[PDB]
Symmetry: C2
Subunit: 181 residues, 2 copies
């Protein structure tokens, strides 16, 4: 039988969150600013298809997010999100979008000034998980050397990096306009 | 051949403002114990039978302890919260530990006997998944209340033939459950 490539047998991977959390907590401010989506794994919840541009402001408690780009229907779209500590005290954040739902998000590795590798995973009740991965860049392109750092980090938690699809980014995107939405 | 919880079209409009206005003053009456009477097929619900949800209201949100028999036969406890949507939208978020959070609307409740609950999420490919529950104040629910739930779901075009009854009653270890 055929199922989507984002439903995978087994339980979400372990991931050492406590380590990442201690490392990332004092650096929140540095995480703010603009991040471009460089690539992601097949994701049926993402409404923005191309030129995905995420603007993060940090108010000391959370990050407020404005995500913009071109939707699947060819129009411009702006979505509002928030990234805040998980409300049960687990050492991960919840990524939440307006009119949608919220999911756990772990920053598996970032150097803050070039790249960030991100990961979200959900267990189902029938022996399968679904995971969603992203490669974020501080600019419209990301150099092979940072891309490989994400590829290693995802390989290390057993994600088939063949699942990544490149996002359209670059001078063909109306970034100046997106910023005004 | 897709799962019956993956449905064509956009999530339904539900009149969330009318509901919010009705329920806001009565939150305190929503607390206490609620049993899951029936639900539409749901891949995130880890407790299979004897499902008992205990709600306490602290003023801003509800703290939940959900217990029952998991799909492996073992007893299970899950911790949840129910709080207003953090963007100011007139619906609640239902959030469970080690899981995710989804929007939840209470389509109809009389507080003392039944509740009909609804959650819906839209996909980027023109379909949606919705999840529905019927809650009862006891292990059983009279026909007259089940029918009110049926009418509320029909009204929003949920196909009520998707409901499966949950195991409750004599065979459940509620007394042990209360203790977890």
């Amino acid at each position: 039988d055929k199922i989507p490539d984002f439903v995978v047998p087994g339980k979400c991977a372990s991931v050492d969150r406590n380590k990442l959390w201690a490392e990332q907590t004092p650096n929140r401010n540095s995480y703010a600013g603009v991040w471009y989506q460089f690539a992601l794994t097949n994701n049926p919840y993402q409404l923005i298809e191309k030129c995905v541009r995420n603007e993060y402001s940090f108010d000391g408690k959370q990050f407020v997010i404005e995500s913009t780009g071109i939707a699947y229907d060819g129009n411009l779209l702006k979505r509002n999100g928030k990234l805040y500590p998980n409300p049960f005290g687990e050492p991960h954040l919840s990524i939440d979008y307006e009119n949608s739902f919220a999911a756990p998000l772990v920053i598996l590795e970032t150097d803050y000034s070039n790249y960030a590798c991100l990961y979200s995973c959900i267990d189902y009740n029938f022996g399968y998980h679904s995971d969603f991965s992203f490669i974020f860049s501080r600019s419209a392109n990301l150099a092979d050397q940072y891309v490989k750092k994400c590829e290693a980090a995802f390989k290390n938690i057993n994600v088939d990096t063949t699942r990544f699809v490149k996002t359209v980014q670059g001078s063909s995107c109306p970034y100046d306009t997106q910023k005004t939405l």
